[PDB]
Ligand binder design. Structure first.
Ligand SMILES: CC1(C)C(=O)N([C@H]2C=Cc3c(O)cccc32)c2nc(Nc3ccccc3)ncc21
Length: 302
């Protein structure tokens, strides 16, 4: 029930020797979601993939991606203190409420497209976008999960033809699947067997719901393109008419990262009173250490 400046409350999930426990930052009262990986178990390959995630989480600062606050390292176990998304899975929302209205789907999809483009902007490819992989916050805002089962209907055609499969245009195909799922509540490419799943995915043809708008169906045509080269960049799909209905004022533009504020005097005095030195505060922040000093600062900005 106690790790660092944290009190473990519930358990939002267990699994692959990792336990995600809902916690409360002790010094700030702020709620967090702590991922507890037992490194002793993890096979040789799962570790490199865990370290690649740690490296990635430390870099992304988007309001639609789960923020990382702290990394607590021990020889046997790893503690990743991340942002808690109360609303749960989008998958579980789509099963509970059915399809979203295009208006509502647009609200969430803009958030998804912005966050995935921003990843590509920093040369980071998710390669595994799923509805399970997207979370919702207290205000129904998208909070994309982690980078390291319903994995096959989101698979790009290039998976079934052995071709490279390392590019960002893989995520564009996947994003198209997600758009379809968000507006229709079902998968565009289905099957009973994977031979069937492959035959549909490679044919590239999907079922169009009688209620879907010509604009929405057009955007699907911008994502779900068979030749990877022939697939549009996320920056050019951002300019799409369906994407900007109602946002005739604010067109979807690539996420422009905010500038660093490692010197806020409110949060700095609070932390100076807490026993931390101004000196260690700036060093932890500039050094992007994700230590107890940095986590105390990040969490104080709420
Ligand atoms: C730390 C982090 C990013 C994470 O690893 N998960 C896990 C844990 C359960 C789970 C899942 O059911 C689906 C995706 C991710 C996850 C998180 N789940 C939440 N909220 C939640 C709330 C109710 C139901 C499901 C998820 N917030 C943050 C995270």
């Amino acid at each position: 029930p106690h790790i660092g400046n944290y009190r473990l409350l519930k358990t939002i999930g267990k699994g692959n020797f990792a336990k995600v426990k809902l916690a409360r930052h002790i010094l700030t009262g702020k709620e967090v979601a702590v991922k507890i990986i037992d490194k002793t178990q993890l096979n040789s390959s799962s570790l490199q993939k865990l370290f690649r995630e740690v490296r990635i989480m430390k870099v992304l600062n988007h309001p639609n991606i789960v923020k990382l606050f702290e990394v607590i390292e021990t020889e046997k176990t790893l503690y990743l203190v991340m942002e808690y998304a109360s609303g749960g899975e989008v998958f579980d929302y789509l099963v509970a409420h059915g399809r979203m209205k295009e208006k509502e789907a647009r609200a969430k999809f803009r958030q998804i497209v912005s966050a995935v483009q921003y990843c590509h902007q920093k040369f980071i490819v998710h390669r595994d976008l799923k509805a399970e992989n997207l979370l919702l916050d207290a205000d129904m805002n998208i909070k994309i999960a982690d980078f390291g089962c319903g994995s096959p209907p989101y698979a790009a055609p290039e998976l079934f033809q052995g071709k490279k499969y390392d590019g960002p245009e893989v995520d564009v195909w996947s994003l198209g699947v997600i758009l379809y799922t968000l507006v229709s509540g079902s998968l565009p490419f289905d099957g009973q067997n994977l031979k069937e799943l492959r035959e549909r995915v490679l044919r590239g043809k999907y079922r169009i719901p009688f209620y879907m708008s010509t604009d929405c169906e057009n955007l699907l045509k911008k994502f779900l393109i068979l030749n990877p080269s022939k697939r549009g960049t996320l920056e050019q799909i951002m300019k799409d008419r369906w994407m900007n209905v109602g946002h005739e004022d604010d067109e979807l533009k690539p996420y422009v990262e905010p500038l660093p504020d490692y010197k806020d005097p409110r949060r700095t005095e609070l932390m100076v009173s807490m026993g931390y030195t101004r000196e260690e505060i700036q060093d932890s922040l500039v050094g992007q250490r994700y230590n107890e000093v940095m986590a105390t600062y990040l969490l104080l900005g709420y």
